[PDB]
């Protein structure tokens, strides 16, 4: 861990981070659309936080929880979402289950903390939102689910930008066995790959890609929907679509390619409620311990001396460096700010808000 600077001063009068207000927002997202907020340049209270959110457990990975109190960080990145009851054990670090395979992957290499907390069910509305642009482009609008149902993807699929799930109407017009539904595809996209063959008294046997469906496809190589695990920081690339439910039977070029709601596969849902409260997960990424201006106010930080006449590493109102401090009477402090800069942008001076004393800073 990087050590705290020998001379450290925080910026005064920063706003409160209000992390608790964000965690307790009654509009709670599902892991499918996990929400992220970055907290910077503000003061937080971990002890207050753990009391104001009905905390069930809190632990840290690659970091000592007790070292948060009183510390400063460059930023604290929070990710949150409601927990479907059946998926709770997916959230163990390193788990290959559905939540981390296909919704939210917990970074295990960073310094992080996982908060398990809950909100009163009667005030919680779950926000289930499909984050995949391509799904939405071809007909996915909303979920139609019970209150407190929490969506999760089992399997995600990615497509490139020429993807269209509908068969070409000209191809479909001569199929006699297993005619696929068809429609016009957007300009700049390729029609679904389809083949007509003869076989045992079927003169016009039509088979297209992604059969029986993209999850169970015989030949994944010929299915343009490609399996994708979510990486750190990513959302589900998309539900797989049953391409036999995109387009309409005998649809011509006057119908735009559209998948029905039930064509989107490989997801499910569960309530987040137990003991009449919605259970919720939140991940804390702690960036840049012992630096920055995202600082805990849990402790009365006893301000140390400004060591003078000696090369010293410092962290002054967010700005780091090393130099030799020499106290000076106020008349020689040529500015009104708490820091003093030269022509090339380097700090040459400092005013201490704790003592109102002024100092020159020289290089070592
Ligand atoms: C939660 O909902 C109940 C009834 O709908 C209401 O009486 C209560 O004030 C709400 N709580 C909050 C914090 O809004
Ligand atoms: C939503 O689902 C319910 C069943 O839970 C059903 O009765 C209703 O018709 C559905 N509404 C729409 C718009 O699909
Ligand atoms: C998308 O993948 C298909 C694979 O069949 C390919 O034909 C097409 O050119 C690709 N499009 C782009 C933009 O890479
Ligand atoms: C943070 O906790 C300390 C210790 O109890 C307390 O004195 C201080 O008022 C708290 N500040 C906030 C903003 O909650």
Author numbering: 311 to 674
Study text:
The human HKU1 coronavirus is a lineage A β-CoV and is comprised of three genotypes (A, B and C). CoVs enter cells through fusion of viral and cellular membranes, which is mediated by the interaction between the viral spike (S) glycoprotein and the host receptor. While S1 is responsible for receptor binding and recognition, S2 possesses all fusion machinery required for membrane fusion. Surprisingly, we recently found that the HKU1 virus, another lineage A β-CoV, uses its CTD, rather than its NTD, in the S protein to bind to its unknown receptor.
After removal of its 6xhis-tag, 1A-S310-677aa protein formed crystals in the C2221 space group with one molecule per asymmetric unit. The crystals diffracted to 1.9 Å resolution, and the structure of 1A-S310-677aa was solved using native single-wavelength anomalous diffraction (SAD) phasing. Native-SAD takes advantage of the weak anomalous signal of light elements naturally present in biological macromolecules such as sulfur and phosphorus. The construct 1A-SS310-677aa contains 24 cysteines. The anomalous scattering from sulfur and phosphorus is very weak and requires merging of multiple data sets from either multiple crystals or from a single crystal collected in multiple orientations. Accordingly, 16 data sets from two isomorphous crystals collected in multiple orientations were scaled and merged. The overall structure of 1A-S310-677aa resembles the shape of a two-arm ‘boomerang’ with the core and SD-1 subdomains in one arm and the insertion loop in the other arm.
